[model samples]
Target: ADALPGEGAVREVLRPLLKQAAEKTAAGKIVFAEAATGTGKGRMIASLAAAAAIKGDTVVVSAPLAVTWQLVNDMKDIPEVRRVGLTLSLGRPNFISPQRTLEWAIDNERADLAAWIEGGGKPLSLVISHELCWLLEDALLLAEDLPADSLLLTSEDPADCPAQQLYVAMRSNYTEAGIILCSHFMLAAHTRMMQMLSLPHFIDTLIVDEAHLLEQAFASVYTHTLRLRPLMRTIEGLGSRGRKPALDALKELFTQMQVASARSTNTSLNVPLSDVPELIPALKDTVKTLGALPTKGMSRDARSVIRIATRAANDALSGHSRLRIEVTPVHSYPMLLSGRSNLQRALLGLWNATGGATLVSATLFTTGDNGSLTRWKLEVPTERAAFLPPVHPAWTTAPVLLHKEFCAHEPDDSPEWATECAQTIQGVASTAQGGTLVLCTSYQNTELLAGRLGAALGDRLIVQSKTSSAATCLAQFKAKHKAGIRPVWLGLGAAWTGIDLSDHSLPDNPELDRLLSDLVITRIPVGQNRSLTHERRTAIGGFRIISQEAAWHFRQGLGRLVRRPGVTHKNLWVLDARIYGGAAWVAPFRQILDRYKK
Candidate 1:
């Protein structure tokens, strides 16, 4: 395969799709596509965004994981679309501020005036992600709680600080102007629910990508869970789970503390730190009483049951048994029932927020085998059809080789397992060059193996630090690789998916075949599918739900390959084959091998 485009291939391939999306926008029908791998999908998306913009409609692009092409700019053929990434940061609250910002923008009429006021261009096109969509939902809900005319300002008062608040508000207002959402999962009903009840309008385009993951996406999003430990921790942290008398005393002290803080603000001098006194002992006694309660019994708190509640409430598609804690009603229903079937309420908000929607995925299925389109169509109606059919393989005549006899198991002893894995990775990294994607299953496992691999491989390795952000780590690894360095990256968990380091330039660059790699080193003391429920769920209900989520994420991780095309052989080694039961789902898993053959 030539390491170049096939003579204007990009233009010829994407033109029709672009024209159609624009036409559909004129027709008032949402356009959705299922672009399989190798289908020149990225080019098509870029083209469609430009075409949509040409039609005077704003184009928004979103996805589950950030891909490299997202950084590219268009030439004369396509308009420049500003991509705004919506990330879920661990350190800060992700909601309220964004929406409040947008509300402020719109209420002040700053939204209507765009860049056109000062000069002559339209508002900049914004690109966002699916997770950001959830943020928008949260922000809008918070916006509703603020007094209608009251706006948080940019001043010293904590309540007046509008930094995050302004950004969210601006983004939401622009989205209301017209924005797009792209993601792996199209649990349309659920995502729509987030959009409508909270946002000012509907989501324009619910674009899907890595369509093959659609079935998996639906399963994880639609499914629900309930655990007691987290709930108990929540109550205790809130100072409300303890004895009734003690809780009251603490509550009273909290009130007094607020009073003193307010009083201190009224006077110029701050109050002495120790003068307010501590919470009453009654409150302390309540915390002890709550701890003494039986952990085995079900928590009666409504939030505790929300995760486990499977049934819809009142047949109105409204959630039931929702338990929530907030300064105000942050959202209509903070906790969701397991299978809230309503889809309309979810989608209209998205559509209202944006004029149209286009759902694209490689695996938005025709049938409901893993989970079907029936539920989605019922929720967000569209003229569904496959878009960007499978792009012909660039490697049509490449020789295929099968190395089936390769052993990937570790011995029963964990220490032995760790030692063996270290030795094996040293051998693998020695032979491969450019980039080696060594995936681990957990944060602990990634750190341990990365440490070992870094030592054995010495300067040749580029292990992802536990402390670094995902982008920072990738930048360090890529810089090393570009400078004639052979670096192995240790990416575990979500790292397995959403990254595309494989490009045509590094064809012989060894990529760890995740499916081909054994994960025995990370297995618990006893072999199990999960840490907490592996034994129990296996004995009682089986690892059906979890296995599905894992497998879905596994395929996504495997898909980190095929970036920039013209790749020959990418090896994935599955270390734990024991989990591959001969269960019916195993057959679907095998379907992947067949797909590669195609």
Candidate 2:
């Protein structure tokens, strides 16, 4: 393959450093690098991996599915990485598992990915994506006879799934790859996975990209929630037919838990799962019995009931420490996991597992406690580590504009607020050079705003729904933009981080400059309030928790603005007023914007 194009500024600046980092890793040292988006970080990673492969070492890189796919394209550009063909293996959700009813469900919506599954005794380059659930189930069936020096890259860390850690155990114990790339979540999750699976330390060198998001990712991975409504439905479905011993025992235990928490005043009350001694053991027993059942022998309805109950029980067991029991009947879950200490310990365990580690992110360089990145129990001494100056884009663009009038805290039903938000969104889209990407805070917000804006904007609005896949929406929106129609893309959290508008840019093509013209943030990109983590956040430190995660997301959303190479113009409008009201917590957010300003 030929060398990738577009190697003017980014490669010139990062090539030497990339070489040095790889050398240091080979020499048993950890290097943390913070590279900006357009600085060809992906290319640098590919170059490093290729160099390692040339040295007879197998290289593995882990990132989100989309990111891994992008890196594969980047890897193809490096001339040194020759004779490599991409092959993808996804979790069962991407395909129709025998147990599943539908073949073309939302889970099957991942864009068609291709990889050369047939190899001829050469080194194999494998890209693994999707959840680890299916992989775990089929772990035994996977071919263990892999070639020497094979490169394995995954979109998710092994720790994301307990089954993933177990899968890692099978590989690390029997067969190990050369160089592995994974997120902090992978490391943290791996640590817990090892302990749970009783596996030994296997990771050699750790390079954490987007290091700032690591702690939050750890929080997300360890955090567990059990929805009560679903639990009851499953339990009822199982026991409604006749008297089942295990089902009856589980029901009795749940009844006792409800009675114990009956006196709580709040809608959601925090109590130790240990408080109800019988609950845990009963759930464990139920799961065991469900697992032991012969699915083929049972009726379809019976099989579905067992599957639902088993899944919910497994989730409940995953959480360590106290449980948040929602005594309020009118809610999603009657009880869920809200454990903070368990999360802290899981992260600390991760730090111990890595021989040496480096946390890298463009924004992590300037966060909390005198620039010493601190979250929960882990804190890196940034002063000692090599800190690079913030990499600015070669071509600067327009500054983000904070529309204060659109920012407000009001009831969802407030007609005046709704009208203002709708009008603000419409007004921006009316004059945009291309399409507008409106990032709503949540699913409900997306629906509310989409409906209002659709009524006002007509065909100009392209709203995504909960039932449809993000891949579908993004493709449709991109198609519209390619065809020269400016549609307002209304989406939830996934749209904020997933879509890179510049990916569609054809530099040689004439219409390259006419990309996305505006980005609208409905609210600050804060973590959701109705989360197990939110409950845990209060237990640790409420406002600080929200502030740290929110700031990271705000920067991520802002990142989508100028993804196109060279100086580009994208008008950014934040409909949240808190940013402009001298909110001290948002100082970090403002500082980030100030740094990138032309």
Candidate 3:
């Protein structure tokens, strides 16, 4: 197959890196890099994999997110040399389990993925999610009770095991077996996968798609959170207060447990599963105290105490609760208590497993500062082994003019912001060259803006509303509107990230999609389980862990733009001034913005 019209664009962006990776692999050193988006990072990795295959080496590529698999799949359309076709294999039912996905790729004869779908042979490529890689590192390959020849197969016991040396010797022979698709975590499972696989030989190139998300991804994999939702529910279920006596006792025990755990030299709160029940007394006290408190609308402080107690109870009673005591009462209220154990273990394990990894995010810091790049490095083992630099996008059209007055913080009365927003988009929709994405911060806001834009743009604009999933909505939006034909693609936060559009010089697309206008008071919604009490309204709502995770979500919402090619439109908008005030992270957010907006 000869080159297509865009082949040059693909090659110019990828070839040098591919050549370097190929060389580094031959030189016995792992090739690592932070390839920015629009540099064709995906195509470059695919090319490198193809090169490895030609050299009799298998390149197993994996990403933590599924959207990355889609990106890889798209690479198959890139023609190979000598008219030899490349192959693609995914799990059956369109969802392959981690183990099966790997095995399928390993066993896929090139013919199965050949242009002719009916045959089977060496599959040119295999793609799967990052979680599968972690499962493999955990050595939980394959589902139980499946044939040895099938993807559903693999033993927990070492394949040829009788313990120790013999097992190690046996496993050693399969070292260069095949490319294994895994997340960056797999490479650094609590026990780094690199120690198991010879780095230069087994895995050569690493491609971090949605590279912007890498930072939080690393944090997510390393940071642990344990809560008490299950146990609390269990206590309530013990016969509609039937087990109230036991719960009352348990709550008392748990309080002592907290007092005990908090005093440990470090803030680390790990109690052995056996010693966990010691908290039963404190837990019982909590149950009794909570029962006495206002049941329905307890003040925020009261609920906060409940959450703290629940988490403490869960940690203290981790083992006993798993025993599944029968709940006599029908406890309708949901009590979620969770916590993370073995964070150090997880960190050590992942560090040793994958060599090390870096986390990436656009808003890792405030507008003026280098956005905690160093703090992040210190937080993870990657500080020494990996480099995580925030590459600020040259926000070509930024300070794109934030119209604070145009932003509606008060949803009910702020018809003005909606009106102005709709009016602004209407101009782009009616007399625009490219597609427009009208972004909103929330659903109601979406409707308000959509209604206004619909009324004004009429048939000239194509409105794409996001319901649940942005990927699904974006796919449909992209499908209905041809490159030149569609005037606008509209939605709220979801449309902002995970979108890759060719810069077609669409006149209105820039104005409509680039700016992010929000109501003044509408702070980015955080997660229910947030760290600080201020983020959540109810005691039940303030989950430190949940809040931390929500930071990623809100950031992801803002991440919709400048994805991949880094907002070529030059101008982007964030009308919600609250981003500067909501949380500490916003400080770094502005720092990043300042860097780009400069």
Candidate 4:
């Protein structure tokens, strides 16, 4: 506390609450806390972690990559940071082996056997980024060497990795780490890793920072998708070499399945199949045979082909409740997995295991006719708790400028809506001299708006794509903003929570330096088919899931503006008029507005 920065009214109010929460969490009791922006939530968590370390307690902080990245950078500078051991265990594909020679030569198809190594290699550890890890053959296999006792910090959550081999490798590391810091996806959605969260006596506390986003995170974790492209690729791989008869049989089977599905009226193409059960066995058997072939004598391409085919076969045969075959103009396949029941069950499992838990967020509570914290419960919990922070100065002074636009269907569904959205963005960008950030619901909408904004604003427009790194994009935006150049940034879904644009939050800046002047929210975010949102609504009660999740996402997007300490005034444009359509829809946002306005 003495070495850390800032000691204001907000810190005084939160310091003791955090300490108490830590004590209670150590004592095995669930705690829920809501502290708005400018509340120093991250610092408070660090302070608690430090205190726990002094007492020889292993305190794990599960946060997004940005948070973890920031923490690692900040903690390294603290002079008295030795009590806790910090190790950043990121995913890596391969390394330059100390004993092996680096000089290895190769030739294409027409070359002779004249390739060799030239020199001996020394001990070397080449640290690679997450993006580079994907290009390697055995990234997870390499990650198996992570230390056990260190406080394991990672950019990617072990539970969510697509490769099952990496998940298995991570199981021991997660258990062995004195403190494990990860994202909500690992704890909520990654079934394999979640199974390992046994809540040992030493691991008594479970803290959920940015807790308001739990519903949305869980919704994503529960969602499932099965694309036709990968399935078809696997089929082609199986029939690649001297297997024309096998390829013909597979194509015929696929056609029959597609024909049956296309006959259905629903978009899901739900169809009965008398031949499917009989036909699948032959294909499955062939895939199994190819997968079992001797890999030691095969070419690299052949090995990859068999691996893809085997995985696809397993995915197609996996068990699940909902199965819907989707058909397109050129291709079609059955989506065998879709539902919220798995997540529902997982929540129950987590609640039952962890007796002491804390969920902290800026906008967890809302005002209503029956205003109370009881609304935060996922199920009918016979027990409860709380850890509220002092009211933020901005909560009573900052203003929210609502730019409403109502659509009969989804916001991005209409061409008129896209044009309206673009115009709204143009208006906001044209007027604001300070930095501007536009948060969009989908990549398509982001591109649409980015093109419009770019055409109007040229080089001043800095658009972040789904493929780009958040850290890199943010660095560029921050540099431009700090130089007194107001750049317009267009961001998609991940950017909503993954970014930190506050001028003061930067290490070299003062406490209250504001950079942003205008923020444009394209529309109210609604779940798509990707999240099994439609399926979940029909099975479970609709209102309970979607509405609450959307409200949480809305608060997150809106909250991006005021990211610094003390009061920072900013304007928000909510282009979605559905915000004014119903009390239920507007109620959540009104609570935030009430705090910021008078």
Candidate 5:
């Protein structure tokens, strides 16, 4: 038989797929599932987690959203999950770790926290920030419930938790709980360290909520960087030690590395190991020398430099031909880094190391199975997994207005081209009944557009670059939108996927649900920033590779437009003329737009 009554479309679409996703995930096998935002993926996770946890399995459930990353009193409403949750510990806090300022702990407001940490008890939030007090950065549930050797679900992307005030969850912490919650960043960090240290993998069923970012996550966490100036500054302090030649060799290395960066087709300057010869051995020797040195009172800067050099050198040595010795323009200096253009081996290792995984995201299947070229490059075996498509339909009928080719003639970064783009965005923002999110091709364009548009829409505009952090501004941006302010968001990077503006309330309600009415993309993000990984990926995958990344980004942008179930008042403004025509890299985006063509 079928099921009971529920929200007509959402229930119907999710019912079968949710059951399918959870069942597959529960069975401890790799599965791929796509459920758009506000589509009840959290509810699906609840079932998946509780189902696995009851079987005495340690479930690792992860999501990208910080608001939903934890299993607070909210998940306790789920009887099955709550029953397991009712009996929990690690509820300790108020740092007495002598390294930190215990003086603050003695203050009466925090004295209760001190009492709890010293004895053994629990409670919630007190606020504070890193730069020392802008927002309540760590105020909410600030590790009041997590203590030493206690299982913790960590979410470390884009940075929120304070390292000092927080309890550091250990490796044994992985399996200590019925279910652990984490982010793609932490999951990647854990996997790399545990596997590298020859430690046992403790997860039973790993469920990735925003799984499309897994590839990006692994790439971000594993890329090893070695800053030249810092290394020089710190290593020079160790002049008395037998390490001057290594220090001189390091400075010489970056001289070539900067010239290597000069050859950069894009920001990610992916030079080869041989380009800066002797770099690997130099750092390797430096690592040994640092370890052997008298560390009785060695400076932290020096120790950190050694670690940075050691890690980068190790990565280059291990990756060999796969390794790319790239350079990054960091503020005043250029730093060398080591990264693999292709993570085929590492991705394969993750699948092999884990007990089983459920890689799920809204944009996983940009094309049907075997259709997406990026998936092949990601080393995802689409054939090996059981992936389910929704039986019920989604509303993507919102019109997409493509660029007027004549208005955007200049391919170069100039005023006329930039001015027209800003004007177009202004027009789009004018129509936005809800919030307007604009995705720029790069940070430079973000600045340009912000300056150009600042005059007229100054108050309404929310530039992500000029904030303490995106999380802070994004929160305030949402607050303004909720308070009936039509804020126009401009920025790129994670905005393509991470920002959720789903308003599933009564349609067109100003306070409750001012659905994102317009999603203006300044241009199609087509390998705009070239990294060695993507460069090689482009080389092998060809046009498909370029199209694949853009397609994924395009789909993510579309998802942002129509996060809620009902959405016809939205307009996708594509300011790039190429998207409307025969550019080889535009095919994937075109295929998506064709579905919504009016």
Candidate 6:
């Protein structure tokens, strides 16, 4: 498989670091890199990875599969890319859940995927979503008929995991294939799978694009959250000594909740594991009782239950002092016990399995006291990382208004602040020429803003989560805006990233351009989770942790404005006063905004 170069073989204006980064990745050193939007980072990395693979170096490119999927679609037509037959790897649907597999089979009305998963979990070298991989990790890989694959059928007890050559039972055409593509979840799933069998270095180079999202991607795929009621049910149903201990464990959990609820002012709150001292002991007891049950007759779900419980217990007792309970109401059950998977710890096996790894993103370098690279908790030495100044496409005085009304004195989440924010959003949205994306920090605020915007804008207002569906709402907003109806997209988390309003058809200098001309970020995207992570982060002092995380989200939010490459915005209203306030993190954030301003 040879590499393809464009008439854009044009690297003239390209960042010079691409060569260095590629060399570093090939040299087998862990690399952390940063590059801004429109920097050609993707092409540079993809080209080099393909070149290496063509040179007989096994390269596995990991990203949100949409990127890989789109890459395949865009490049597949080209003869060079087509000949290589880059694999798009999707885990089988049965790998998702035996109970849910039938539902997914029915739901995957996308007959292509449904039919594919229907085949024993075969490696496509093709495409899949990050979510499917999470279910794989969460399952602890004890689901239904695997690719007739061995490791896929491993026991939760890692010692029982039988070793097998990678893809030995599969067809031989692409055996030792140079290039493989998957999401971080897919990669993480395999990491868990290989770690179980104690294998090292599955690929030559692991290129993780948009590496800023690695933390969330890894945590989502790596972490497990066991609900109390369902867990109790699983325990009660177990035919071993697990029942009595499981009951005691659930009882202790409820006791902790009883004491902790007084401190919880919201529907959900984080209680320190120390506050719930009995949970670990009870959880470990249940794990011990259930784990002793012979694996021969244990149901897959039953095995997963004990594995999940054991991981939860061990996560807390590992002495990281960074585990906490996420008390949230799910259905009839009032709360769920959960823990943060150690991000670096989970990646260690993957790191060991790759000869060279590159974690690249536009927001990799952060602004904080502990420093940006460390903030993501990748835990690599300083020498292993590299940074580049972010380059923004041209813009003049950034059509942004740091509103005075949403001031620092008042808590941004308070009703008064939200009311003021909604009114401010209305004021800004009315004058904006095209679509207005109102990115709120909370659903409550989104709904509150929606009430005002919906009343004022009426049909023009498209509220996410509250509307038909995010996809539908975004589509309507885009369609309406394109037709000159002036849509207002008001949403919380989902709207912040991946809301593409770029329209190539829009004319230059058109008075009323049919594109997203304004974006309203109602608040700095600070961590609202008052959990063990929050507590552990604050131990470092100041708002760096808060600011750093928010800054990443801030970059992601700001990214929506420039989706139409080299374009200017009408008004990017940051209604949050914190950016203009005297917070320690504000200066750096202000600088971030300054970068986008010409």
Candidate that would win on lDDT: 5
Give the candidate number with the greatest TM-score: 5
TM-score of 1: 0.50
Writing each residue's lDDT as its tens digit, candidate 1 over 156-253 gives 21323333433344345333333244333323323534653122233334344444443333323343322222233334544433435433533543
| lDDT of each candidate versus the true structure | 0.39, 0.52, 0.38, 0.49, 0.56, 0.55
lDDT of 5 at 282: 58
lDDT ranking, best first: 5, 6, 2, 4, 1, 3
Candidate 5 TM-score to native: 0.75
TM of each candidate vs. truth: 0.50, 0.68, 0.46, 0.66, 0.75, 0.74
lDDT of 6 by residue, 337-414 (tens): 444634556666666666777776656666522235343466554554444434333432344333334434343556
Off by over 4 Å in 3: 1-34, 43-62, 65-178, 184-344, 356-378, 382-420, 448-454, 457-468, 483-490, 502-598
Q: Which ten residues in a row have the lowest lDDT in candidate 3?
A: 140-149
RMSD of each: 15.3, 8.9, 14.4, 9.5, 8.4, 7.5
| Residue 325, model 4: Cα distance from true site in angstroms | 6.1
Candidate 4 ranges with C-alpha deviation above 4 Å: 1-10, 50-58, 72-177, 182-202, 211-292, 295-316, 321-341, 345-355, 363-424, 442-455, 462-485, 504-515, 528-530, 533-539, 566-569, 580-584
lDDT of 3 at 370: 34
* Candidate 1 lowest-lDDT run of ten: 320-329
Candidate 5 clash pair list: 126-139
Write model 2 residue lDDT over 422-512, tens digit each, in one string.
Answer: 7887778877888788887766677777667777677667776634445446667777878777878886555766556663466554234
Q: Model 5 over residues 1-598: C-alpha lDDT tens digits? A: 2321121223455667766765666565577777666565665656666666666666677654243423333344565655454222121221222211122234213443344344432222110112211111132122221111111212211122333234333222323446666555556666666556112376777777767766765665567655555456667777566567666667666655555555656544465677546555555655565565555466543453465466665666664533343454533444455666777777766766656667666667757643254355456556546667732244544333433323354335667677888887877777678888888767678878888999888678888652223444456567777778798888576577656666634645523455466777777777753555678877876776777777777777766666655545566677776665566666777787766654
lDDT of 3 by residue, 1-598 (tens): 4323123435464544445545544444433444444455565555555555455444555454344464456555554421233322222111212323333233332211121112211121122212222122111111111111111112222232122223234334433333334444433331323223223332333334444444333433332222233334445643443356545555544344455444444332233445434445554465554454443444332243344444444443544222111111322212223223223444444333332222232344322233333233223443333332333343422423333232434334266767765655554455444455555556676766767766555554444432223443444455545443554555544354445543333434544443222211233444322222222223343454344344544444444444443344333345454554555655544543453433
lDDT of 4 by residue, 335-384 (tens): 33233434455555666665466666666654322213223333314354
Candidate 6 residue pairs in clash (backbone atoms < 3 Å) = 6-9, 87-125, 87-126, 88-125, 88-126, 88-127, 201-353
